[PDB]
Symmetry: C3
Subunit: 102 residues, 3 copies
Amino acid sequence: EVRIFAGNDPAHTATGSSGISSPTPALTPLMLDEATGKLVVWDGQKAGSAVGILVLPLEGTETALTYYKSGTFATEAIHWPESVDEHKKANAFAGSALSHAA
Amino acid sequence: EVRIFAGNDPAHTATGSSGISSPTPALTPLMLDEATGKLVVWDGQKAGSAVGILVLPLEGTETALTYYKSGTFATEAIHWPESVDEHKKANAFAGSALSHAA
Amino acid sequence: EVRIFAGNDPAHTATGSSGISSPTPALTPLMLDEATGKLVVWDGQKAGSAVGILVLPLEGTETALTYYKSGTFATEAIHWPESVDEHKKANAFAGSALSHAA
Protein backbone atom coordinates (compact mmCIF):
# COMPACT_ATOMS: atom_id res chain seq x y z
CA GLU A 1 0.00 0.00 0.00
CA VAL A 2 1.74 3.13 -1.29
CA ARG A 3 0.63 5.76 1.26
CA ILE A 4 -0.12 9.18 -0.25
CA PHE A 5 -0.53 10.71 3.19
CA ALA A 6 2.93 9.89 4.47
CA GLY A 7 1.73 11.27 7.79
CA ASN A 8 -0.62 10.72 10.72
CA ASP A 9 -1.78 14.32 11.27
CA PRO A 10 -5.35 14.45 9.89
CA ALA A 11 -5.74 15.95 6.45
CA HIS A 12 -8.47 18.56 6.07
CA THR A 13 -9.84 20.22 2.94
CA ALA A 14 -11.11 23.67 1.99
CA THR A 15 -12.67 25.42 -0.97
CA GLY A 16 -11.55 28.64 -2.62
CA SER A 17 -11.73 30.76 -5.77
CA SER A 18 -9.68 29.19 -8.54
CA GLY A 19 -7.70 31.29 -10.99
CA ILE A 20 -6.48 28.29 -12.98
CA SER A 21 -7.49 28.30 -16.66
CA SER A 22 -6.25 24.93 -17.88
CA PRO A 23 -6.67 21.22 -17.11
CA THR A 24 -4.82 20.71 -13.83
CA PRO A 25 -4.34 17.28 -12.20
CA ALA A 26 -5.09 16.48 -8.56
CA LEU A 27 -2.28 16.62 -5.96
CA THR A 28 -0.88 19.80 -7.48
CA PRO A 29 0.68 22.51 -5.24
CA LEU A 30 -1.32 25.75 -5.15
CA MET A 31 -0.32 29.36 -4.44
CA LEU A 32 -2.24 32.64 -4.27
CA ASP A 33 -2.20 34.96 -7.30
CA GLU A 34 -0.80 38.29 -6.13
CA ALA A 35 -3.00 40.33 -8.48
CA THR A 36 -6.35 38.57 -8.24
CA GLY A 37 -6.29 36.72 -4.93
CA LYS A 38 -7.40 33.55 -6.70
CA LEU A 39 -5.70 30.20 -6.18
CA VAL A 40 -3.48 29.05 -9.06
CA VAL A 41 -0.70 26.50 -9.54
CA TRP A 42 2.38 27.03 -7.37
CA ASP A 43 5.20 28.38 -9.55
CA GLY A 44 8.05 27.14 -7.37
CA GLN A 45 9.61 30.62 -7.19
CA LYS A 46 9.32 30.96 -3.40
CA ALA A 47 9.49 28.63 -0.43
CA GLY A 48 6.39 28.85 1.74
CA SER A 49 4.14 30.28 -0.99
CA ALA A 50 2.36 26.95 -1.54
CA VAL A 51 -0.86 27.26 0.49
CA GLY A 52 -2.60 24.10 -0.67
CA ILE A 53 -2.74 20.86 -2.67
CA LEU A 54 -5.48 20.27 -5.25
CA VAL A 55 -7.82 17.50 -4.10
CA LEU A 56 -9.75 16.97 -7.35
CA PRO A 57 -8.68 17.64 -10.98
CA LEU A 58 -9.78 20.88 -12.65
CA GLU A 59 -11.05 21.25 -16.21
CA GLY A 60 -9.70 24.79 -16.31
CA THR A 61 -13.12 26.45 -16.36
CA GLU A 62 -14.05 26.18 -12.67
CA THR A 63 -14.55 29.34 -10.59
CA ALA A 64 -13.72 27.37 -7.44
CA LEU A 65 -11.54 24.43 -6.41
CA THR A 66 -11.00 22.10 -3.45
CA TYR A 67 -7.70 21.77 -1.64
CA TYR A 68 -6.12 20.06 1.33
CA LYS A 69 -5.17 22.70 3.91
CA SER A 70 -3.43 20.39 6.40
CA GLY A 71 -1.75 16.99 6.64
CA THR A 72 1.59 15.36 5.77
CA PHE A 73 1.94 14.26 2.14
CA ALA A 74 4.21 11.92 0.20
CA THR A 75 6.60 14.03 -1.87
CA GLU A 76 6.20 11.48 -4.69
CA ALA A 77 2.41 11.82 -5.04
CA ILE A 78 2.59 15.60 -5.48
CA HIS A 79 2.91 17.08 -8.97
CA TRP A 80 5.81 19.52 -8.77
CA PRO A 81 6.74 22.13 -11.38
CA GLU A 82 9.43 21.28 -13.94
CA SER A 83 12.92 21.71 -12.54
CA VAL A 84 11.91 23.37 -9.29
CA ASP A 85 14.61 24.39 -6.79
CA GLU A 86 15.01 21.50 -4.34
CA HIS A 87 15.14 23.78 -1.31
CA LYS A 88 12.04 25.73 -2.29
CA LYS A 89 10.43 22.36 -3.02
CA ALA A 90 11.31 20.99 0.41
CA ASN A 91 9.93 24.06 2.17
CA ALA A 92 7.16 24.81 -0.33
CA PHE A 93 4.47 24.57 2.40
CA ALA A 94 6.45 26.02 5.33
CA GLY A 95 4.21 28.37 7.29
CA SER A 96 1.00 26.50 6.57
CA ALA A 97 -0.47 23.41 8.18
CA LEU A 98 0.83 21.33 5.25
CA SER A 99 4.13 19.48 4.92
CA HIS A 100 5.51 16.64 2.84
CA ALA A 101 8.13 13.93 3.29
CA ALA A 102 9.45 10.93 1.35
CA GLU B 1 -29.15 24.76 15.03
CA VAL B 2 -27.27 27.28 12.88
CA ARG B 3 -23.70 25.94 13.03
CA ILE B 4 -21.01 28.64 13.25
CA PHE B 5 -18.26 26.08 12.82
CA ALA B 6 -19.38 24.76 9.46
CA GLY B 7 -16.62 22.21 9.85
CA ASN B 8 -15.41 19.18 11.80
CA ASP B 9 -11.71 20.05 12.08
CA PRO B 10 -11.20 21.18 15.70
CA ALA B 11 -11.06 24.91 16.27
CA HIS B 12 -8.18 26.15 18.42
CA THR B 13 -7.53 29.61 19.85
CA ALA B 14 -4.48 31.78 20.49
CA THR B 15 -3.63 35.11 22.06
CA GLY B 16 -1.65 37.96 20.54
CA SER B 17 -0.90 41.68 20.73
CA SER B 18 -3.85 43.70 19.49
CA GLY B 19 -3.38 46.89 17.50
CA ILE B 20 -7.11 47.58 17.23
CA SER B 21 -8.22 50.89 18.75
CA SER B 22 -12.00 50.74 18.44
CA PRO B 23 -14.92 48.54 19.52
CA THR B 24 -14.61 45.42 17.35
CA PRO B 25 -17.19 42.59 17.37
CA ALA B 26 -16.35 38.90 17.73
CA LEU B 27 -15.97 36.72 14.61
CA THR B 28 -14.05 39.45 12.81
CA PRO B 29 -11.18 38.56 10.40
CA LEU B 30 -7.75 39.67 11.64
CA MET B 31 -4.51 40.50 9.81
CA LEU B 32 -1.04 41.56 10.94
CA ASP B 33 -0.11 45.25 10.86
CA GLU B 34 2.95 45.58 8.64
CA ALA B 35 4.44 48.43 10.68
CA THR B 36 3.81 47.33 14.25
CA GLY B 37 3.37 43.57 14.09
CA LYS B 38 0.16 43.87 16.09
CA LEU B 39 -3.06 42.15 15.08
CA VAL B 40 -5.73 44.45 13.61
CA VAL B 41 -8.88 44.01 11.53
CA TRP B 42 -8.37 42.39 8.12
CA ASP B 43 -8.68 45.09 5.43
CA GLY B 44 -9.70 42.74 2.61
CA GLN B 45 -6.91 44.04 0.35
CA LYS B 46 -5.13 40.69 0.00
CA ALA B 47 -6.14 37.05 -0.11
CA GLY B 48 -4.35 34.99 2.52
CA SER B 49 -3.53 37.94 4.80
CA ALA B 50 -6.26 37.02 7.30
CA VAL B 51 -4.41 35.13 10.05
CA GLY B 52 -7.23 34.84 12.57
CA ILE B 53 -10.83 35.37 13.67
CA LEU B 54 -11.64 37.36 16.82
CA VAL B 55 -13.09 35.08 19.50
CA LEU B 56 -14.30 37.75 21.96
CA PRO B 57 -15.32 41.39 21.31
CA LEU B 58 -12.78 44.15 21.94
CA GLU B 59 -13.45 47.49 23.61
CA GLY B 60 -10.67 49.07 21.58
CA THR B 61 -8.35 49.59 24.53
CA GLU B 62 -6.98 46.05 24.95
CA THR B 63 -3.26 45.38 24.46
CA ALA B 64 -4.04 41.75 23.62
CA LEU B 65 -6.83 39.75 21.97
CA THR B 66 -7.94 36.14 21.51
CA TYR B 67 -8.39 34.53 18.12
CA TYR B 68 -9.20 31.21 16.52
CA LYS B 69 -6.12 29.95 14.67
CA SER B 70 -7.69 26.84 13.11
CA GLY B 71 -11.06 25.36 12.16
CA THR B 72 -13.68 25.67 9.42
CA PHE B 73 -16.10 28.58 9.83
CA ALA B 74 -19.49 29.54 8.42
CA THR B 75 -18.98 32.40 5.97
CA GLU B 76 -22.20 33.95 7.31
CA ALA B 77 -21.08 34.21 10.95
CA ILE B 78 -17.92 36.13 10.04
CA HIS B 79 -17.99 39.93 9.94
CA TRP B 80 -16.46 40.87 6.59
CA PRO B 81 -15.34 44.35 5.52
CA GLU B 82 -17.73 46.50 3.48
CA SER B 83 -17.70 45.57 -0.19
CA VAL B 84 -14.75 43.20 -0.04
CA ASP B 85 -13.59 41.46 -3.23
CA GLU B 86 -15.35 38.08 -3.37
CA HIS B 87 -12.21 36.22 -4.42
CA LYS B 88 -10.06 37.73 -1.69
CA LYS B 89 -12.93 36.98 0.68
CA ALA B 90 -13.09 33.33 -0.39
CA ASN B 91 -9.35 32.88 0.04
CA ALA B 92 -8.92 35.31 2.94
CA PHE B 93 -7.44 32.58 5.19
CA ALA B 94 -5.55 30.58 2.53
CA GLY B 95 -2.15 29.60 3.91
CA SER B 96 -3.28 29.35 7.52
CA ALA B 97 -5.07 26.57 9.35
CA LEU B 98 -8.35 28.49 8.96
CA SER B 99 -10.95 28.23 6.22
CA HIS B 100 -14.61 29.07 5.78
CA ALA B 101 -17.53 27.72 3.76
CA ALA B 102 -21.26 28.37 3.39
CA GLU C 1 5.91 19.34 35.78
CA VAL C 2 6.88 22.40 33.75
CA ARG C 3 4.83 21.92 30.56
CA ILE C 4 6.65 22.94 27.36
CA PHE C 5 3.51 22.46 25.30
CA ALA C 6 1.36 24.95 27.16
CA GLY C 7 -1.46 23.72 24.97
CA ASN C 8 -3.74 20.79 24.16
CA ASP C 9 -3.79 21.07 20.35
CA PRO C 10 -1.56 18.23 19.09
CA ALA C 11 1.95 19.20 18.09
CA HIS C 12 3.13 17.88 14.72
CA THR C 13 6.60 17.98 13.16
CA ALA C 14 8.01 18.42 9.66
CA THR C 15 11.35 18.35 7.90
CA GLY C 16 12.83 20.97 5.62
CA SER C 17 16.04 22.32 4.08
CA SER C 18 18.12 24.11 6.69
CA GLY C 19 20.10 27.23 5.86
CA ILE C 20 21.55 27.55 9.35
CA SER C 21 25.36 27.42 9.51
CA SER C 22 26.06 27.45 13.24
CA PRO C 23 25.23 25.43 16.36
CA THR C 24 21.56 26.19 17.04
CA PRO C 25 19.69 24.91 20.12
CA ALA C 26 16.32 23.16 20.04
CA LEU C 27 13.11 25.17 20.59
CA THR C 28 14.39 28.01 18.42
CA PRO C 29 11.98 30.01 16.19
CA LEU C 30 12.56 29.49 12.46
CA MET C 31 11.81 31.67 9.42
CA LEU C 32 12.30 31.23 5.67
CA ASP C 33 15.34 32.82 4.01
CA GLU C 34 14.03 35.15 1.31
CA ALA C 35 16.96 34.50 -1.03
CA THR C 36 17.48 30.75 -0.71
CA GLY C 37 14.17 29.38 0.53
CA LYS C 38 15.99 27.50 3.27
CA LEU C 39 14.89 27.57 6.90
CA VAL C 40 17.06 29.70 9.21
CA VAL C 41 16.68 31.26 12.65
CA TRP C 42 13.84 33.77 12.99
CA ASP C 43 15.32 37.29 13.13
CA GLY C 44 12.42 38.88 15.01
CA GLN C 45 12.04 41.62 12.38
CA LYS C 46 8.47 40.69 11.41
CA ALA C 47 5.43 39.30 13.17
CA GLY C 48 4.13 36.16 11.49
CA SER C 49 7.40 35.29 9.74
CA ALA C 50 8.21 32.49 12.21
CA VAL C 51 7.08 29.31 10.42
CA GLY C 52 8.47 26.75 12.84
CA ILE C 53 10.26 25.76 16.04
CA LEU C 54 13.42 23.62 15.94
CA VAL C 55 12.75 20.18 17.43
CA LEU C 56 16.35 18.94 17.67
CA PRO C 57 19.62 20.92 17.99
CA LEU C 58 21.68 21.58 14.86
CA GLU C 59 25.46 21.35 14.56
CA GLY C 60 25.41 23.98 11.84
CA THR C 61 26.40 21.60 9.05
CA GLU C 62 23.04 19.89 8.41
CA THR C 63 21.33 20.26 5.03
CA ALA C 64 17.97 19.55 6.68
CA LEU C 65 16.27 20.11 10.04
CA THR C 66 13.16 19.04 11.93
CA TYR C 67 10.57 21.48 13.21
CA TYR C 68 7.20 21.58 14.92
CA LYS C 69 4.61 22.93 12.48
CA SER C 70 1.64 23.04 14.88
CA GLY C 71 0.82 23.14 18.59
CA THR C 72 0.73 25.65 21.46
CA PHE C 73 4.09 26.30 23.13
CA ALA C 74 5.28 27.79 26.40
CA THR C 75 6.78 31.21 25.67
CA GLU C 76 9.48 30.43 28.27
CA ALA C 77 10.78 27.26 26.59
CA ILE C 78 11.36 29.01 23.27
CA HIS C 79 14.74 30.62 22.54
CA TRP C 80 13.94 34.14 21.36
CA PRO C 81 16.36 36.56 19.70
CA GLU C 82 18.12 39.16 21.86
CA SER C 83 15.91 42.16 22.56
CA VAL C 84 13.11 41.23 20.19
CA ASP C 85 10.07 43.52 19.90
CA GLU C 86 7.45 42.21 22.33
CA HIS C 87 4.60 42.59 19.85
CA LYS C 88 6.43 40.81 17.05
CA LYS C 89 7.37 38.18 19.64
CA ALA C 90 3.76 37.71 20.72
CA ASN C 91 2.57 37.32 17.14
CA ALA C 92 5.72 35.67 15.78
CA PHE C 93 3.74 32.60 14.60
CA ALA C 94 0.49 34.33 13.58
CA GLY C 95 -0.72 32.85 10.30
CA SER C 96 0.69 29.39 10.92
CA ALA C 97 -0.66 26.51 12.97
CA LEU C 98 1.74 27.46 15.79
CA SER C 99 1.13 29.74 18.76
CA HIS C 100 2.64 30.28 22.18
CA ALA C 101 1.41 31.44 25.58
CA ALA C 102 2.79 31.84 29.11
